[PDB]
Structures are given as structure tokens and as C-alpha cells.
Design a protein around this nucleic acid. Sequence first.
RNA 1: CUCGAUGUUGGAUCAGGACAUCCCGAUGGUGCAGCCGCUAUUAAAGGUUCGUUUGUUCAACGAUUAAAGUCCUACGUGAUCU
Lengths: 162, 40, 100, 177, 38, 38, 174, 161, 99
Amino acid sequence: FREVVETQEGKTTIIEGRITATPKESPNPPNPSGQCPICRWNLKHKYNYDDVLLLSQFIRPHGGMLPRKITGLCQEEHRKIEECVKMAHRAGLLPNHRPRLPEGVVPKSKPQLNRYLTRWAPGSVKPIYKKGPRWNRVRMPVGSPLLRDNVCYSRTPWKLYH
Amino acid sequence: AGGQWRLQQGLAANPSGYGPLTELPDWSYADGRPAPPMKG
Amino acid sequence: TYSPLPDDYNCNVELALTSDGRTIVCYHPSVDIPYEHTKPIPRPDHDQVLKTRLEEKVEHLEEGPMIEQLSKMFFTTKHRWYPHGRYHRCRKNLNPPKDR
Amino acid sequence: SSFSRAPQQWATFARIWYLLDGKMQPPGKLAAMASIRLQGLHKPVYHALSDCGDHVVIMNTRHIAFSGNKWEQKVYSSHTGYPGGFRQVTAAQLHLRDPVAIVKLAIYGMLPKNLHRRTMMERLHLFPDEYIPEDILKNLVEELPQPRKIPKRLDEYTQEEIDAFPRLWTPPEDYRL
Amino acid sequence: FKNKTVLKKRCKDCYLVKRRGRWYVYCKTHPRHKQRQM
Amino acid sequence: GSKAVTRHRRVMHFQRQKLMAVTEYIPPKPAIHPSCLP
Amino acid sequence: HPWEPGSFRVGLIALKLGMMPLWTKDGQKHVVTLLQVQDCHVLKYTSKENCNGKMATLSVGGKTVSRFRKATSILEFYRELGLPPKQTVKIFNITDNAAIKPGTPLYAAHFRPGQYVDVTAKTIGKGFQGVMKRWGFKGQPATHGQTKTHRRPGAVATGDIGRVWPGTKMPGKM
Amino acid sequence: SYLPGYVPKTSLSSPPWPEVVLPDPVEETRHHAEVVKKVNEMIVTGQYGRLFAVVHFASRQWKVTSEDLILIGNELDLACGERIRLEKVLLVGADNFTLLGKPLLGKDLVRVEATVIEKTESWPRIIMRFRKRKNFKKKRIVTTPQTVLRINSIEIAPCLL
Amino acid sequence: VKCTKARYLKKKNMRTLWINRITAASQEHGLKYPALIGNLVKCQVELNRKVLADLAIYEPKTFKSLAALASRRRHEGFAAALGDGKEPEGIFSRVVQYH
RNA sequence: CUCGAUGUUGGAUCAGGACAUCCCGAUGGUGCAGCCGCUAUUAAAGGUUCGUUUGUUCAACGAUUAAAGUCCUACGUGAUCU
Ligand code: FES
Ligand SMILES: [K+]
Ligand SMILES: [K+]
Ligand SMILES: [Mg+2]
Ligand SMILES: [Mg+2]
Ligand SMILES: [Mg+2]
Ligand SMILES: [Mg+2]
Ligand SMILES: [Mg+2]
Ligand SMILES: [Mg+2]
Ligand SMILES: [Mg+2]
Ligand SMILES: [Mg+2]
Ligand SMILES: [Mg+2]
Ligand SMILES: [Mg+2]
Ligand SMILES: [Mg+2]
Ligand SMILES: [Zn+2]
């Protein structure tokens, strides 16, 4: 990877860039014919929002996603990981990938609510004040439809609406 | 329970059907003599 | 080392078939509690001149407070503690059948 | 067992005290476990009229976790009975107002809709934090396993686990990241 | 802001953004182009 | 009752609903997604 | 202790003597109510921990009454305090720094001119009253044919609900 | 060091249940013979107290032990005091061992005897039909024949091989 | 009329009770009710629910053995299903044939 | 459904509710300079006049008002009245 350092000495600023150590993909992938990192390691349909060891490889230091052109993921897998990362942040599983705060900013104390499999951003969702009849019930989404094809080890399929 | 499995073994789906559990005599005289055949 | 069920709580189950294969034999001896897994029973629970007498501390409580005490002591609702009328009291069988 | 009749009967119908830890657990799964125990449905001697329910102690009810966006979407509605008395509050609003209400309501709704329900609720002991009264602690017999396995945060993984997971891609050496 | 079932960009300076769970059209050049998904 | 042709989509008899549900098109699924192969 | 921001001190119990006019230097007339402190003493102190509430409480009593007319439990309470029994006892929420030893007398000069106070008492009892006096309902006309209907509530609810809402204004004790 | 089907460890890489390895059939066949021999010796040496059995009789199953009573819901064509053998034994159990039929135990293994002690009739059973507004009402009383059996003895023989 | 019709409910409720009691007893050994009943049938054990409920209450060691047997037969099923036919039939999976 | 009866307009009395808001609050747009307006989002806690003629609901008219809202409630309410 490459770092950019700004050093201001007196009246003169100097912007430079240095090449730091770069991690290398583990040798001998089990599926060399695979077209992206996911299927090269036979990981398609076999990871979830809590697989942070997997998810953390595709995000920036501050929690943002990395471009698909850089990672090499396909569109389908890139979108799954993107949603999984959002759920991982919301579940509190990435405590060292928090947003950058400008100097002098200390967030105020906010109520702590433990949550997981959170599809939407909390602030953008309204209360279900009218539930509706049994035959037209308003449901509370859980998880992501992008993961509907994940390997299911139970006889019941994943319920995405509660 | 088990109806489909019993059929796969060539048995009656219901264990009350044909087989020794149902057809064999329920009892015999304590001295050995066989009981009269059951009405069913 | 395969065991269908843990052998540490109720009995040691050993399953076997007869040579003909027509009978299932189940050997299940009881497991005794180990001494190490037990506690010791809690046996452990002034020059007075006057003989110490029994003092009645059973102050009578009103119905309301009494029912609250009973309900809390036995973790019940208050309802069970209230009386019932003559019609119901006299319908109860006072010599019910007893099996064993 | 060769016990005397009265001690034998006492043992079989005794009330067991169970402990359940609600930290990071969904209230519904906690409620499903508590409802069975409070009714006695975990006992082979169960009968509706045997009054054979057990005690359930739930701690850390303040630290329950809903899946999805239930904190924002799930609404608890009540009515004072007076005109204009209809009240609707979200799960988040109720939780900050009463740290045991969510678990209590989930259990109350799962118990049978009969006159025994409120008696069963008397055998439920909800505590929002780890603190449990000493008397309650002394009668505890068994702690029930948590229904939801708590996922590990990335900072909780040992270097052995991190090293075991392969690196899946090679980033460009000149990428700023 | 006018509520719209179908959002359409009315000039080159209109941009689509999804905020508070719904899509919006924002335009700095012509504020009258602002639209809210209904 | 309503006529065989209506302005709204007429409700079907439950048995017919089940018939439709059971006879839905099922696309051929490949063993390995074609995008995952050279 | 010295006064600190956020501190709540004890109040008083007083008897309502009557009312009186006073005039201000600008010429305005203000009627005032005279409240006499009659044998006001602190009776009990309950710590914040044992109160069952957020604050400590201090019990004050007012006006001496006959011991021959009080329950035995109350008499033994006052016997240990060393004071004659009081007609009314009230509970004042206070901060810990404002605690006062039981038995301390309280005087009118506890308050000072320019302060603002809240006064709580039982309203005058008017017994069972109709809707007109109790709730200020208009009633019905006196003539133009009204039949035995002049001070009555009228309709009490709608027909649909087939019931009367809790809290409905009706005749009762005022 | 990665096989063709290797998958890195994730929450869904493998099933949630633990892997189970069943015993070697050859080794287990020997262990089974040892268990059967041990239980057979307990029978030969009489290391059992009270026995119970599950017997199929008159369409239904009865968990019985010595001195028990059972109420058969029909007549059996037997005089009072006649002793009979209950030939359908699904299970015989002791304090420390249980034998299970597949589905029935061999007659050489277990013998359950019983005696007819009463032949009587049930109390009257009302059968009432009613349909509102149709002048449809009928009443029938039925008493069903019954037979009371006393289970005299449960005996087992050392015939486990 | 109630007395007459109640004879159906008595049978229905009794079986519901046995299932509840068997379910409780099975869970004490980490088995769900369908796993016990189904796999016992596959062992040619025809014990009915009434007796199984009685055994759970009054013969808990026999019931644990039955739970173990069902669990063993259940594991043999999985091993067979995972195999491609190479494996011989499980020891407890062999069925006694009658003719 | 009700004719072995579910009392039929308007008004009085007391009002419960919806929000598709007349006034009061918060906002976007404007052919929005300002003062006034028009339009849309959000808001139902609180409020929403007195009179002449008419049985009137309405309507017209006089004088006001921050405003004199639209509706449902057996076209709310006669074992409360008229
Ligand atoms: S190309 Fe194989 S999963 Fe993306
Ligand atoms: K009519
Ligand atoms: K007129
Ligand atoms: Mg037609
Ligand atoms: Mg008075
Ligand atoms: Mg008047
Ligand atoms: Mg008259
Ligand atoms: Mg009059
Ligand atoms: Mg049935
Ligand atoms: Mg009539
Ligand atoms: Mg109103
Ligand atoms: Mg609105
Ligand atoms: Mg009307
Ligand atoms: Mg009326
Ligand atoms: Zn534009």
C-alpha cells in the first residue's frame, strides 16, 4: 500500500508518497480456476455478516468498502460483502474501523442498543404503528435478501421477514 | 409416524396391519394348550 | 469412544444386539454421585438471671396484609387465599378415592 | 427408589430454580425458554392441573439484542381507557423506560391465556443487570445455555485464528488505501 | 420539494440521492427541480 | 357472482391457485455459476 | 451546611387565618391570605436510601391536638419524640444537606418577603353536585316547553360505542 | 497445503452439528457379544429384583409387573380363576438391564402369566344425539363387557446368545 | 350430549399429553420428539406413546436407553445418507424380515 | 337483519373519533425584494364568534375573528329535552 505524508516546515509544505509493506494472497488457492477471490477459495454461499476475518480484508481502515476493480470481486460477491460489512458495523463487530473524527470532536453519549442482522440504517426506519391484518401484515425485515442463496443446514429456509 | 418407512421395508404402513404383532395369538393357556382363534 | 448420550448424569447405557439380531440388550447400571461433588451438611446453626420464656411473636395480621405475606412466601397470586362460599365448600368430596 | 411415600412425592413435584443470561440474546428466544420452564413443560410428569412450574431467573435483561431493525420498528401499544389514552411506543423507547419490560411482555404473550398465567409470572424474576439478590442467588440450581451464540468482534480473534484464515487477494502495491 | 412517484432529473445539475430511506432529486442551479419520492 | 371477464383480476378458486403455484416455470440451474469459470 | 444550587429545603405547615388587602407603592391593591404557623416541628427524617424515592424526606407536623383522641401507635410515637401530637403531618422532599434533627421548631421567618411559595390544602367540600355546578355545563332552557330537564347532563356518549367512556364528566362529590 | 475442496473456516463453511464417528463394525460386534454375555450371566445368577414388561393385549399395550391388575374392555371366553400366558411381550425390564423385541421378544426368553379374577360389565354409558330445531333427539345406554386380569409372574430365562 | 361427544376429546387429549410428556423426556437427553419416535420405528420397536410416556416417568433408565438407541439409529442414518453405497448397513439399521 | 315496532327533519345538551389542516407550530418550491400571497411536506396537543329573515340543514346579508375547517359516530345523542 501507499501512504501520503504532509510535512510543513516553516513556510514550505512537502507532499510525498511512500510504498509500505503490501500483503500477499495465500499460496495455492484450492480452486485456481476461480474468477474472483471468493470462488478461488470455494467461499461462495459460505460466509455471513459475522465472518469479520473474511469481511475485513475488503474494507478501508475507516470502515469503508474497497472498489471492485481493486479487490477483483465480481459484482455479485462485491454486493454481498458490501451488505455484510454494513451489518457488521451495525452489530459492533468492527470496533477498530470507526469513522475518522476531526480534531476537537467527541461524540455525545448515545443510547446503546445491541442489534444484529440489521438491514437498514436505524435512523431511516419508522415505527410500525399499524400492523395490518394477518393476510396483509407489515413485516420487519431481518438479514439481507442478497444472502438468500447461502448454504442452509436446516430444513427451514432463512426467514428474512419477521 | 413411520408409515413411509414401513412401506419401504415391504411392511404395512400401519403396524396394526399384517404381521406377527397383530396376527399372532394374544394368549394361550398356562399349561401350553393353544387358545381359540381370535375373532378379528 | 463413541457414546450416543453422555454417561455422566443418570446411568451408563451400553447397547448391544444378540447374535441372531432379533433382540436389543440394554445394560444400564446407575451412576452414583461422587463424594467430591457433594457439600457438607450445615449442622452448625451472658449470665442471664431470669429464665428465658417462649415469647409469642405471632401478631395477628389483617386479611390484606396476611394475603400479601402468603402470596409472597409461596410465589402465588392473592386469589387462591380468599375464602369460598358454602355452595362450593359443601360440593368438595371429603372422602375421595385413593389408588395407592 | 425405596423412599417413603411423602418424601418421594415431595421430590418429584419440587420447584427448581433456573438461571438465564440475557446478554446479547434476543428476547423471544429467552421467552421461549422461560415459558416452557414456567409451565413445567420440561418435566415428564407435566399436567396442566399439576401446578408443576419452576422458577426462572433472567439477568442482564438490559443487554438484550433484537435482530433487524426491531428496535425502531417494533411497537408496544396500550390504552389507558380514557378518551385519547391510546399510547404506542417503540421497543427502543420502552427499553430505556423499563429495562425488563421487553422480556416480560415476550414471556407474558407466550404463556397460556388462562388464569394460571399470572401465577406463573410470579415465578419469573427479571433483573436488568448482573446483580441478583442474595436470597435468589442461594436458591439457584442450574443455569440454562444461552440460545444465541454471541459472534466474536474482530478485535477478539487470536492471532492464531487470524493467521489460520488465508489472505484471499493481492492488493496493488501502489494503492493508497 | 414536490412529491413524485417517478423521479426524473430535469437538468444536468440534478443529482439523485437516497436519504432517510427514500430517493430525492436535488438541484442547486434550479431549486424548483427538487423532488421527493412518494 | 361475477362474469368470466372482469375489469379487476378475479379471485381464483383455491384449487386453481394451488395448480398455478405448482406449475410455475423453473429455470435450469447450472452446477457452477458460469461467471465463476474461465 | 451552606446552600448550594439544586438544594431543596423543608417547608412549613400553617393555619389559614383569613384574607386581607394590602396596597403597593404603585397604588395597586393586592389581597393576601394570612397563614399562621402554629406549633410546627420536624417529626421524622428518612434517608434517601430508605425512602423508596429519589430524595430524602423530612416529616413536619402542625397544630397541637388532644392526646385523648389519637391512636395508641401515634401516641407512643409522640411520646418518644417528646412532643404533643399534631393534627396534620406532611412529607417534604429534601436534599441531604438540608436535613434537620427531629423535634426542631419551625417558624414563619423560615420564609422571607419576595419569595414565591406553593400552598397545598384540601378544597372546601361541596358534597354531591350536579354537572352545572361541578363541571360548568350549560344545562337547558327554562321555558319553551322543556319537560323536567333544566340542569341535566344531556347526552353522555355516542350511540355506537354502546358504553360510557372512563373519565366522563358526571354528577358526583365536589 | 490446501486440498481441492478446502474451504477456509467460516460460520457456514461446515455444518453446525459436531462430526460423529461410529464404531468399527468388526470391533463393535465383539463388544456387543461381551455385553450380551454379561447380561446373560446376570439372568443365570439371578441378579435382578422386580421385573416389568410391556405386553400387547387386546389391540393395546400394557406396562405390567407382578401383582398388577388390568381391565380388558371385552370378554375373553375364560372362566374366573383360569391362568393364561401373555404371549406378546415387546419389552422386559429390570433395574440394571432391559430387553427389547423387534418387535416381539422370543417366547423362550420371557414368560408372562396372568389369571382371570373377575368378569363383569362397565357402568352405564350414555349415548345422546341432539340437533337444534330439527326435533332430532335420541338416547341409548350401553354397558360393555369387561374382564379383570391379575398379572401373576414375569420370568426370564438365560437365552441371550 | 357433551358426555357423548367428550369420548373423542378424551382420546385426543390423552395422546397430546403423552406427546408433551415424551417431548419433555426426550429433551432431557438432547433429542427432539420426532427424532425419537421416528428412529425407534426404524429399529422395529413398536412401543406406543402411552407406554413411552409411562416409561419416562417410572423407568427413567430404560427411557434413556431408548433415547440412546434412537440417537444411535439416527446417527447411522446420517452416515448412510452421506455414503455412496460403499458402506454396509448399520448394525442397528438391519431389519428383521418376517414371512 | 328488523313490520308480536330498530321512533322518523332541524335545534338544545354533551360531545368520542379521522386528518384529506380553517387558525396556531416546523419546513421545501415560487413568475418568493419587502408587506401580502400561491403551492407542497410535516403537525390533530389547543382553538375554530355573535346576529336579521327562513322549521330549515343550507343560502343570502350585518358585524367580528388568529380562524369562523372537511367529515364519521343508527345523516352521534328524544327511557335527557324540544
Ligand atoms: S466469480 Fe466466483 S464467486 Fe465471483
Ligand atoms: K319494520
Ligand atoms: K325564524
Ligand atoms: Mg357465472
Ligand atoms: Mg361541605
Ligand atoms: Mg341557563
Ligand atoms: Mg308532559
Ligand atoms: Mg320545568
Ligand atoms: Mg389421532
Ligand atoms: Mg320483540
Ligand atoms: Mg370533540
Ligand atoms: Mg397530513
Ligand atoms: Mg341521527
Ligand atoms: Mg336514546
Ligand atoms: Zn435541475
